[PDB]
């Protein structure tokens, strides 16, 4: 993140930080965004094409 522009007064000087948002996998975490649901390790529902909540609400 330090300035690496050659030949400037702010060379190697500290600057803006960065917000890093790393995604991680979880089981029965209510805060997480659910992607799959299982019963006794069998898959509960399928889909293949791209999901969109408000398109379900229009089309159904």
């Amino acid at each position: 993140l330090l300035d690496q522009t050659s030949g400037v007064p702010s060379y190697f000087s500290k600057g803006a930080d960065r917000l890093e948002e790393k995604m991680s996998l979880t089981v029965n975490d209510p805060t997480s965004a659910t992607i799959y649901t299982f019963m006794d390790g069998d898959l509960y529902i399928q889909s293949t094409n791209a999901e969109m909540d408000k398109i379900n609400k229009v089309l159904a």
């Binding site: 690496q4 522009t5 050659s6 030949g7 400037v8 060379y11 190697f12």
Partner: protein, 55 residues
């Protein structure tokens, strides 16, 4: 298209090894200031052969 690249200069007793992303002035930082930039005269007078040597 024939041409010359003439005068950063830095004097030190410490060994500097540049990296792939090293800028011009990293020599002074890597030496903890245990050295000096060459005088202005080095940039002005070493661009041609004449009687004006930079010491």
């Amino acid at each position: 298209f024939y041409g010359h690249i003439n005068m950063y200069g830095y004097v030190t007793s410490y060994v500097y090894n540049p990296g792939m992303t090293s800028s011009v002035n990293q020599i002074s930082a890597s030496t903890e200031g245990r050295g000096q930039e060459v005088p202005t005269d080095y940039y002005m007078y070493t661009s041609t052969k004449n009687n004006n040597t930079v010491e």
